[PDB]
Amino acid sequence: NTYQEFTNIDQAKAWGNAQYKKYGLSKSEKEAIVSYTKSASEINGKLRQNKGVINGFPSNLIKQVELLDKSFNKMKTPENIMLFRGDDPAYLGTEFQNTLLNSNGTINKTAFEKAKAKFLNKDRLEYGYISTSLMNVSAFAGRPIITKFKVAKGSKAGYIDPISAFAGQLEMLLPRHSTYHIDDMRLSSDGKQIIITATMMGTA
Numbered sequence: 517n518t519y520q521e522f523t524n525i526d527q528a529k530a531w532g533n534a535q536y537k538k539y540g541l542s543k544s545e546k547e548a549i550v551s552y553t554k555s556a557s558e559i560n561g562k563l564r565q566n567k568g569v570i571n572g573f574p575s576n577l578i579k580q581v582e583l584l585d586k587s588f589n590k591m592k593t594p595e596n597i598m599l600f601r602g603d604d605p606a607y608l609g610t611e612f613q614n615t616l617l618n619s620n621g622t623i624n625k626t627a628f629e630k631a632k633a634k635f636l637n638k639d640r641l642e643y644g645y646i647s648t649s650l651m652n653v654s655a656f657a658g659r660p661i662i663t664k665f666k667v668a669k670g671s672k673a674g675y676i677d678p679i680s681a682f683a684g685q686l687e688m689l690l691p692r693h694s695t696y697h698i699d700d701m702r703l704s705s706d707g708k709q710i711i712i713t714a715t716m717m718g719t720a
């Protein structure tokens with residue numbers, strides 16, 4: 517099966533805007549999404565710390581998480597699509613925070629082989645929501661790890677760019693507790709990034 521890869525910003529925005537018009541999100545769902553784009557690192561950080569258990573969160577955050585989850589009843593991709601994400605070294609583990617990058621800006625090759633040993637051809641579960649973009653965008657394309665996600669037709673995925681608090685991000689949000697399988701890992705041509713290819717699964 518082939519996956520749609522946008523290569524033009526205006527073409528991506530036109531497609532995304534068309535999807536967003538059909539969702540019919542409620543007022544409260546939209547509020548939850550806007551706030552998510554302002555506070556995602558904090559929300560996702562708490563979901564990771566507590567392994568997806570929200571019982572101990574403040575009541576307003578439980579409500580927001582519930583509305584974000586509910587929004588995906590309305591938000592599905594109509595086709596196989598490729599999505600993009602930038603991550604910093606901690607994404608790979610605590611052990612990579614201060615070892616992944618060399619002084620000259622290149623990925624350390626020993627750290628890269630350890631990352632492959634740890635993640636290649638294996639499932640990974642993410643407790644947070646996964647923010648992605650329809651293309652490589654400048655806000656995140658300079659991070660040391662770039663992931664290309666293969667997301668199948670009918671999967672939960674929502675273009676929230678129209679109500680994001682930030683410009684230029686072409687954001688497609690994926691649900692929390694998603695599992696993906698890392699199919700490939702390689703160094704970029706200039707040796708400054710790791711490129712990950714992964715197939716998105718469900719939230720089971």
Ligand SMILES: NC(=O)c1ccc[n+]([C@@H]2O[C@H](COP(=O)([O-])OP(=O)(O)OC[C@H]3O[C@@H](n4cnc5c(N)ncnc54)[C@H](O)[C@@H]3O)[C@@H](O)[C@H]2O)c1
Binds near residue numbers: 555557561604
């Ligand atoms: N990064 C992107 O590709 C991207 C794409 C579109 C929009 N956004 C926007 O950026 C903001 C969210 O940023 P984010 O995506 O970095 O937030 P995040 O919560 O996913 O990640 C925060 C930080 O933790 C790291 N991280 C992610 N998963 C981790 C894990 N399992 N263990 C340890 N560290 C982990 C990330 O690399 C990042 O440095 C929001 O405003 C969102 O709208 C980001």
